[PDB]
Amino acid sequence: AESHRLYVKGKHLSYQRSKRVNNPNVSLIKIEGVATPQDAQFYLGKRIAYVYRASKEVRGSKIRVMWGKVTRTHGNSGVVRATFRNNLPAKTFGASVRIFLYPSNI
């Protein structure tokens, strides 16, 4: 077909942060669609991957990845939390975000 995608689309909103002090270790998820804490419960445990593109090729690719995962409901909305191996990079507040479907349970 034309579609391949056997990830859910969705965005890097934040750091956890209080009004004036932020915590790069935790990140926040706008899963495109998911509006409640339930809807989020599905995507706990499911993996994430901010993909992006360096100029200088490594390692054989132009393309890099940081391996989430999703870990909990953040308050009302099924924003969710979202350690990653490496902390996402801020410039990323507003960047697209691959929730996957593995560590599956269906």
Partner 1 sequence: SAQKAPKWYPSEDVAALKKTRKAARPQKLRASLVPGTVLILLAGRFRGKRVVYLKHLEDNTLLISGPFKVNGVPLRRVNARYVIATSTKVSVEGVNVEKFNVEYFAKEEIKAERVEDQKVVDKALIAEIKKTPLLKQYLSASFSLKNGDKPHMLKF
Partner 2 sequence: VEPVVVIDGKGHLVGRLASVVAKQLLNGQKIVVVRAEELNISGEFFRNKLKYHDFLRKATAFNKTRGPFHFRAPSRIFYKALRGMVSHKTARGKAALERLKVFEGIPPPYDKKKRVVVPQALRVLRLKPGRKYTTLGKLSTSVGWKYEDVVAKLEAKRKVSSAEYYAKKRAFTKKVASANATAAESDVAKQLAALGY
Partner RNA sequence: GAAAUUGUUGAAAGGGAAGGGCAUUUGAUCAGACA
Partner RNA sequence: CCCUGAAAAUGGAUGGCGCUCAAGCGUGUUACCUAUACUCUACCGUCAGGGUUGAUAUGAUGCCCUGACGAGUAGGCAGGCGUGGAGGUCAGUGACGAAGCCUAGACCGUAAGGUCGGGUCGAACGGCCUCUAGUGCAGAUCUUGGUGGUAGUAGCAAAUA
Partner RNA sequence: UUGGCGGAAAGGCCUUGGGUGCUUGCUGGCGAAUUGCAAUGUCAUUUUGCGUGGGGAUAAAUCAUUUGUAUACGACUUAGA
Q: Tell which one of 32, 36, 67, 86 touches partner 2 (CB under 8 A).
A: 32
Residue linked to tokens 């926040």: 28
User: Under the criterion CB under 7 A, does residue 66 sit at the interface with RNA?
Assistant: yes
Looking at 22-30, 31-39, 68-76, 81-89, which segment touches partner 1 (CB under 8 A)?
31-39
Q: What backbone phi and psi angles, to 5 degrees, belong to 55?
A: -75, -60
Biggest CA pair distance of the chain: 48
Q: Tell which one of 8, 29, 48, 70 touches partner 1 (CB under 8 A).
A: 8
User: Under the criterion CB under 7 A, does residue 2 sit at the interface with RNA?
Assistant: no
User: Under the criterion CB under 7 A, does residue 94 sit at the interface with RNA?
Assistant: no
For the CA atoms of 20, 15, 39, 99, the dihedral, rounded to the nearest 10 degrees, stands at: 170
Cβ neighbour number for residue 81 with a 10 Å cutoff: 17
**Which option in partner 2, partner 1, RNA, none does residue 106 bind, with CB closer than 5 to 8 A by kind?**
partner 1
Instruction: Answer for the pair 31, 40: CB distance below 8 angstroms, yes or no.
Output: yes
**Which option in partner 2, RNA, partner 1, none does residue 48 bind, with CB closer than 5 to 8 A by kind?**
none
